Design a protein around this ligand. Structure first.
Ligand SMILES: *[C@@H]1O[C@H](CO)[C@@H](O[C@@H]2O[C@H](CO)[C@@H](O[C@@H]3O[C@H](CO)[C@@H](O)[C@H](O)[C@@H]3O)[C@H](O)[C@H]2NC(C)=O)[C@H](O)[C@H]1NC(C)=O
Ligand SMILES: *[C@@H]1O[C@H](CO)[C@@H](O[C@@H]2O[C@H](CO)[C@@H](O)[C@H](O)[C@H]2NC(C)=O)[C@H](O)[C@H]1NC(C)=O
Ligand SMILES: *[C@@H]1O[C@H](CO)[C@@H](O[C@@H]2O[C@H](CO)[C@@H](O)[C@H](O)[C@H]2NC(C)=O)[C@H](O)[C@H]1NC(C)=O
Ligand SMILES: *[C@@H]1O[C@H](CO)[C@@H](O[C@@H]2O[C@H](CO)[C@@H](O)[C@H](O)[C@H]2NC(C)=O)[C@H](O)[C@H]1NC(C)=O
Ligand SMILES: *[C@@H]1O[C@H](CO)[C@@H](O[C@@H]2O[C@H](CO)[C@@H](O)[C@H](O)[C@H]2NC(C)=O)[C@H](O)[C@H]1NC(C)=O
Ligand SMILES: *[C@@H]1O[C@H](CO)[C@@H](O[C@@H]2O[C@H](CO)[C@@H](O)[C@H](O)[C@H]2NC(C)=O)[C@H](O)[C@H]1NC(C)=O
Ligand SMILES: *[C@@H]1O[C@H](CO)[C@@H](O[C@@H]2O[C@H](CO)[C@@H](O)[C@H](O)[C@H]2NC(C)=O)[C@H](O)[C@H]1NC(C)=O
Ligand SMILES: *[C@@H]1O[C@H](CO)[C@@H](O[C@@H]2O[C@H](CO)[C@@H](O)[C@H](O)[C@H]2NC(C)=O)[C@H](O)[C@H]1NC(C)=O
Ligand SMILES: *[C@@H]1O[C@H](CO)[C@@H](O[C@@H]2O[C@H](CO)[C@@H](O)[C@H](O)[C@H]2NC(C)=O)[C@H](O)[C@H]1NC(C)=O
Ligand SMILES: *[C@@H]1O[C@H](CO)[C@@H](O[C@@H]2O[C@H](CO)[C@@H](O)[C@H](O)[C@H]2NC(C)=O)[C@H](O)[C@H]1NC(C)=O
Ligand SMILES: *[C@@H]1O[C@H](CO)[C@@H](O[C@@H]2O[C@H](CO)[C@@H](O)[C@H](O)[C@H]2NC(C)=O)[C@H](O)[C@H]1NC(C)=O
Ligand SMILES: *[C@@H]1O[C@H](CO)[C@@H](O[C@@H]2O[C@H](CO)[C@@H](O)[C@H](O)[C@H]2NC(C)=O)[C@H](O)[C@H]1NC(C)=O
Ligand SMILES: *[C@@H]1O[C@H](CO)[C@@H](O[C@@H]2O[C@H](CO)[C@@H](O)[C@H](O)[C@H]2NC(C)=O)[C@H](O)[C@H]1NC(C)=O
Ligand SMILES: *[C@@H]1O[C@H](CO)[C@@H](O)[C@H](O)[C@H]1NC(C)=O
Ligand SMILES: *[C@@H]1O[C@H](CO)[C@@H](O)[C@H](O)[C@H]1NC(C)=O
Ligand SMILES: *[C@@H]1O[C@H](CO)[C@@H](O)[C@H](O)[C@H]1NC(C)=O
Ligand SMILES: *[C@@H]1O[C@H](CO)[C@@H](O)[C@H](O)[C@H]1NC(C)=O
Ligand SMILES: *[C@@H]1O[C@H](CO)[C@@H](O)[C@H](O)[C@H]1NC(C)=O
Ligand SMILES: *[C@@H]1O[C@H](CO)[C@@H](O)[C@H](O)[C@H]1NC(C)=O
Lengths: 341, 168, 168, 340, 340, 168
């Protein structure tokens, strides 16, 4: 007899590409990819995941906490992973702010980029020695404090000129010192209050537009206040007010001072943020439901199976499948053969 | 493959070969017998499995947001960041595509090499009395029906079972 | 290659082989006849042609300007964008160089495998009366001049045309 | 006789690299690259390609159109591909601008980065209710309109205090509202006019330097005007003028307002740009001659043949060859063998 | 007899990864990586390596040199490779500066990014025709020159109003012209002096805060001076002073002018930096000891042996080993076989 | 490798083979002789040496600092620059890992191919009177002691030294 070596012949619906034979049918393949499905976001496996800056500060937004709004200070957990759930963060209380006149909205999103976040315990500027005649510290019903008395943002001080100081001033300069610990970044919150012509006179003894200038790390910022005719109160406590505040932040790297040149209406920085380390940040939504190997901006919570995946590429953190352009398959069989005649 | 085509190996295939990818056929008075070689099939499967594990070992850095670059304020920077992400995805995808291409190339191209190895398994069992043709076939003095072929695939076939000489 | 060097294959080449890359030679009283194997030649070219198509299938994202970053105003950003482009070009270039290197690796290395396949084509046609040397040559009982060699290359050579036995 | 398997031997001038045998000569290769040659730029095949912002705006530069120069208003066609042909765009008419005192030159290059570009049909600020007393609308002979009457940049309003309002003012604040449609970016053009001491007093009742401050998307910009002693007129209409304008632009993301704090000489924004989508942009030159698979910043118009190319790498869009460091070759033959 | 083909069997402690056989032991390997050791930094082999901006300027910091401190003027050698050895450069003499109120510290780090660095020989502004009444040129004991007479930063001019000109001014505007050569970037150094209320009155005839505004390439910077109550003198000559200066720089691309709007206390730019080409820059330390194939931010001087390396990846210039994630090995032997 | 496993090649190894990686063994009355084939070992070493040189030819752009971006002032840009460097290092690292993987794959997989070539060197010298078994072994009519094996490795062995026929 004649004994020969031969290869099988079966159904060959799968196709893979080769270097020297082009596309060939094969009897079997191992899929290397899947197209993931959209899910709720979740906690990253093996890593505490930050959502709200202050989880236990109820009825407080991230921006509220960042500005040091009364009732909104609590334990701020460190996290190596943070979810950016507000592309344009909003306030929900305290004195009415004209947010879009500065970069202030992004402040809490700046903070969540750090692993560790804490508010300073001492003030960065002493209101009783601050330039521009003698001051008293003003408060508002819009900002009720921890003992339910009238207060203000703990990050700032609404200084009012004393009765013997109701007068216009030349722009004075205060130096903002670096008071944070080894390695920490200091984020200084400040701003200025403005009002209609009448209230300006009562509060400051000047109803002309006031000018404010900040300088830190080679960045200079200039503002000129507005006298009356403000846009309506929004994202605030809800108590009707004739005036508006403008709020800004100022980043001070380790051992770096900043300066604020100001006139009337100044909100001097008090408590400042001290932040260190880096937190990995991706876009997402709240609440975080369950646990996952990988957080994906398009698919949310996602567990890893196949080594690769197809579909919408986006930012992703954790134990993730690697994005590929096409559904790759590993050959697990033989190139198609017609039945032997 | 290209070897078999030039060597005059059979380009067709055997539907009766169901328990394996590669194996043997027998042509005699019985007609055409077909048996699969599990050893050849297992080796092929093991190579692919090792290849799968190798491809699955690749790790690349996560792409997340910049911690410093803020929306609205740093949009121009963020666009470049978007570009960096896109190009990373592009470059790594093509690298993996290349890696998979080379793996499949190896797998498909190794088919004839399994046959060539199967020749050596067959040749030894058939003994010195068999005649190697060269096209992947051997001519035997004895009959080799389906029962005989199974002993070959299982590596238990002896030439002494037909009083023919063996390689000791 | 390394196989042929160890196997004692002829390291030289035959200028008379102009119609193909690989083939056969015959050494006898006629002198030295030379014929090219078209079947083998086509296979090698087809592999290369498929290889060209594979290399030509690679697509990478275009590199254009950032839409937001303006000249003068965003020069520092644009320098980084310039850097990103440079590194993209650098990395993909090296990846492509690697892909081409492996392709040339395969083509050059497959030479001996073409010879090994040509052995099986020759062996079957020459019949059982020929003696396989191992160095890629067969010793025949018969004469084989250029007319005989052309028949071998064309796959029409019969051993019975010299009253010698064939593989049945 | 002895029949053997053998390999050919021919002229082998071509060299390729291998992993395990180093560089080897071969009888034949398939070239994978070419070094392209410089050509005129062209239309991208299968894609409408933008050159000038407004094709039907004759005698108008892109900056002219972007500033809303009279006679320079037309349809701005959408394009997924745009050619940046002016690294530092220039004007060719209207009132003398001190361009380099702001970022204004890049404005049309900013616009061409968008797929869709349109000018608003309504004004973003009503001059008759604008802060800073009552105004009248000034025009110039430098800016003749379509009927050759005195005019001005349609993107702005040269507001002048009325005769009973020729007085200095404190810096007043105007909100620039977002008036563009869903998804569109708003690009607000504005500025201020200045002059010598005499004209300043006549026009504004103040000859002191005026101060202007803009704020949008966290970006603040401050300017202080100059009183007389200006640089020489350039890129303008050619009509002698004692004064100069400074022009700037302001980007407002969707639903975001900006503010302008200003005194005397203010050029309030009127018509604004509404832009959406992204256009792929590379540097190039005009005119676009013919059609091509690929536009390359160094080589211009280019059709694809070989899969790769050698030479100067640069930004490139379309169906392009991928850049490589060396002239790669695919082996199409056999490793060199000496004659037996 | 029976003759067979066989493979050796030896101790196989080395392990490599394969595609189709997983990890396998081997009889021999060629190492492809090393973990480098930290060394002193050094000159890049075959390339002049910049450390200090001015080597012949003894007792001068790079920032001293960049500001044109007296006694600190010299040849700035061109270099295709530069070492950034001061993350935040400091002065060591001359008049007390309030550094952190501007970006001035980075100026010498900005300069070293260029291949070629030279100071202009002519002044960019003539102080005797500069806006703001007639001036005299002030000097200080803090800045003794090469003959130890009172001087000042050669990049600037401390202009003082004459005795009959001690009066306040509105913000005046000066144009800073481009005086550099074809292709060069111009870096304009300028600033302003301030003092307590008394000295301000004596020197300038005004004790109000003064305002300064610069503009170049779309970049605007606004400053308001401080009257008395300054932070302590630091990084200066050590001579006690009641006043402080603030210093800034202004980048002018080829053929581009900048503007400075100023009042009293202005330090007008004089000599400017003209810089061209690009220098490769990495972090490092001084002095440069010896020669090396490759400069690495973490390992310093480093000679190339293995094609790759493991450890801390960082910026690196020259003929360097390529960073890899794991210690790769090339097989130089056979897959392990048990003894027969 | 997988070939030898299917072909029934000896899976073990010979400690006596110290002057080379590959070679021959001989079984007779003398016991078991072992000799290394220097030609085959050298070819394997030369391939590896070329492979090392090939891997060492790779050049990638240096990663240095941006010239325009200043500390403190341009930190957001510098963060993106750090990311670009990081991803470059990551991507090239995995690409090199792939290139080395394929290199080691080739070397380890070429072991059986060296044996197959050693078969052909042995076969020719042994002459037509020797009998090829197929499992990588030959059966000879003559005795082949340690001295005989050494002449085989050196390629000087003649069949006439045992009065056996040679390939003419
Ligand atoms: C929460 O807010 C309340 C105010 O609504 C804070 O209590 C109040 O503090 C002010 C200022 O210390 C007191 O006003 C007066 O201050 C002058 C300063 O010389 C002093 O001479 C007067 O005798 C008077 O104390 C005010 O009396 C006081 N209490 C109330 C009911 O207003 C309260 O401190 C805030 N919570 C915390 C934790 O600080
Ligand atoms: C090899 O390729 C494809 C496998 O996808 C087979 O043809 C496809 O699938 C069915 C065949 O019944 C049909 O939809 C078309 O003929 C193909 N579809 C597409 C989308 O391409 C083909 O028949 C296979 N060949 C063999 C011999 O199995
Ligand atoms: C990803 O995997 C985790 C754990 O493997 C899943 O969490 C489990 O969910 C099941 C069903 O809800 C519970 O019974 C288990 O107790 C959960 N385990 C843990 C540790 O949480 C998670 O739901 C998976 N998520 C996705 C999107 O696949
Ligand atoms: C590759 O395919 C083979 C068979 O084509 C798979 O091996 C078989 O799997 C089936 C069930 O899935 C078992 O019943 C057989 O015993 C397996 N072995 C054979 C047929 O020899 C193998 O699992 C596939 N590879 C992977 C990684 O899944
Ligand atoms: C292998 O190719 C190289 C390169 O083409 C050949 O070397 C060239 O030889 C010609 C004529 O002697 C010279 O003009 C060239 O300058 C050489 N080039 C280089 C790079 O050295 C070489 O001759 C070829 N070898 C064979 C055997 O054909
Ligand atoms: C171009 O020229 C002048 C602007 O100087 C415009 O003429 C005015 O037209 C209105 C029409 O309602 C008259 O009420 C004014 O009295 C005209 N003013 C002058 C000075 O003639 C003319 O309409 C402009 N045309 C445009 C803008 O299309
Ligand atoms: C602009 O052109 C004017 C005349 O059209 C030139 O006049 C200058 O004006 C200044 C003002 O005091 C005087 O120094 C001279 O009258 C002129 N200066 C010079 C250097 O000639 C002026 O030259 C041109 N350039 C400007 C003003 O920058
Ligand atoms: C790229 O290819 C196109 C398509 O052929 C060329 O366009 C043609 O050019 C020829 C003359 O060069 C004309 O006769 C045809 O009418 C053109 N056809 C079209 C559809 O435009 C184009 O010239 C080529 N350009 C380059 C740079 O190679
Ligand atoms: C690769 O080279 C071969 C020859 O070495 C080419 O084949 C020849 O092509 C010509 C015309 O193109 C025809 O006469 C035959 O097809 C071949 N002739 C001979 C004498 O062999 C082949 O075309 C090349 N491949 C590519 C893709 O260019
Ligand atoms: C293959 O190599 C591995 C790793 O070098 C060897 O395993 C090691 O054996 C030593 C004994 O001296 C132990 O100290 C190590 O801890 C082992 N490493 C691991 C990762 O377990 C292994 O023995 C080698 N195999 C052979 C057959 O030589
Ligand atoms: C270095 O020293 C002094 C600086 O005071 C310069 O010499 C003075 O220059 C003024 C200029 O009007 C003249 O009164 C005298 O020539 C010197 N005055 C005094 C009081 O010494 C000298 O020019 C400076 N520069 C050098 C030497 O290059
Ligand atoms: C890297 O480069 C060379 C290696 O040859 C070294 O330079 C020489 O080192 C010796 C010994 O310290 C000294 O004589 C000189 O520094 C150099 N030789 C001569 C003749 O000038 C260099 O030190 C090496 N550096 C490292 C870190 O390996
Ligand atoms: C790789 O091969 C062997 C590893 O076992 C190394 O040893 C050499 O082997 C050759 C035999 O051909 C002889 O020159 C010596 O026995 C060894 N050479 C030396 C210089 O000792 C060999 O060196 C290794 N080669 C490389 C490039 O690493
Ligand atoms: C807010 O007040 C402004 C000015 O009076 C007006 O334009 C707008 O309609 C008001 N909005 C609401 C909700 O009352
Ligand atoms: C095959 O072999 C034996 C005879 O040697 C016997 O079973 C019969 O003839 C055959 N059986 C089949 C199923 O072919
Ligand atoms: C070759 O063999 C046959 C013998 O008849 C014929 O083609 C021819 O005569 C012989 N010689 C040559 C050179 O072809
Ligand atoms: C317009 O173009 C014409 C020529 O086409 C030229 O004479 C003129 O100077 C240009 N500008 C104006 C404002 O007419
Ligand atoms: C400033 O200098 C005085 C002495 O002149 C010194 O006592 C004081 O500590 C210094 N200030 C600081 C903040 O160190
Ligand atoms: C082989 O070696 C043995 C050593 O004792 C001895 O018979 C002789 O030297 C050799 N035999 C032949 C036949 O060469």
């Amino acid at each position: 007899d004649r004994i020969c070596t031969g290869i099988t012949s079966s159904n060959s619906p799968h196709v893979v590409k080769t270097a020297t034979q082009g596309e060939v049918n094969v009897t079997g393949v191992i899929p290397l990819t899947t197209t993931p499905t959209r899910s709720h976001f979740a906690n990253l496996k093996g890593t505490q995941t930050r959502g709200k800056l202050c989880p236990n500060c109820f009825n407080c937004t991230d921006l509220d906490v960042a500005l040091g709004r009364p009732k909104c200070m609590g334990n701020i957990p460190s996290a190596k992973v943070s979810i950016l759930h507000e592309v344009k963060p909003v306030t929900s209380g305290c004195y009415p702010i004209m947010h879009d006149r500065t970069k202030i909205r992004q402040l809490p999103n700046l903070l969540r980029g750090y692993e560790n976040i804490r508010l300073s315990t001492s003030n960065v500027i002493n209101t009783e020695t601050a330039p521009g005649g003698p001051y008293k510290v003003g408060t508002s019903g819009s900002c009720p404090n921890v003992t339910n008395g009238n207060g203000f943002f703990n990050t700032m001080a609404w200084v009012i000129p004393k009765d013997n100081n109701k007068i216009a001033i030349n722009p004075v300069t205060v130096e903002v010192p670096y008071i944070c610990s080894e390695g920490e970044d200091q984020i200084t919150v400040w701003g200025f209050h403005s009002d209609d012509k009448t209230q300006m006179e009562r509060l400051y003894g000047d109803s002309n537009p006031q000018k404010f200038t900040s300088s830190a790390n080679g960045v200079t910022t200039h503002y000129v206040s507005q006298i009356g005719g403000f846009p309506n109160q929004t994202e605030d406590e809800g108590l009707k007010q004739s005036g508006r505040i403008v709020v800004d932040y100022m980043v001070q790297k380790p051992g770096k001072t900043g300066t604020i040149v100001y006139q009337r209406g100044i909100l001097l920085p008090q408590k400042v943020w001290c932040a260190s380390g880096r937190s990995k940040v991706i876009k997402g939504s709240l609440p975080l439901i369950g646990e996952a190997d990988c957080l994906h901006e398009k698919y949310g919570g996602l567990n890893k199976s196949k080594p690769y995946y197809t579909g919408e590429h986006a930012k992703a953190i954790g134990n993730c499948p690697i994005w590929v352009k096409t559904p790759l398959k590993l050959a697990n069989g033989t190139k198609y053969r017609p039945p032997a005649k | 493959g290209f070897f078999g085509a030039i060597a005059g190996f059979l380009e067709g295939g055997w539907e009766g070969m169901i328990a394996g990818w590669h194996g043997y056929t027998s042509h005699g008075a019985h007609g055409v017998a077909v048996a699969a070689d599990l050893k050849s099939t297992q080796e092929a499967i093991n190579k692919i499995t090792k290849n799968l594990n190798s491809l699955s070992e690749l790790e690349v850095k996560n792409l997340q947001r910049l911690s410093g670059a803020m929306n609205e304020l740093h949009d121009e920077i963020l666009e470049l960041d978007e570009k960096v992400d896109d190009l990373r995805a592009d470059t790594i995808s093509s690298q993996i595509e290349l890696a998979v291409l080379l793996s499949n190339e190896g797998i498909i191209n190794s088919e004839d090499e399994h046959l060539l190895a199967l020749e050596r398994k067959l040749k030894k069992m058939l003994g010195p009395s068999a005649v190697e043709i060269g096209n992947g076939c051997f001519e035997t003095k004895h009959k080799c029906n389906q029962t005989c072929l199974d002993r070959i695939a299982a590596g238990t076939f002896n030439a002494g079972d037909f009083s023919l000489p063996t390689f000791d």
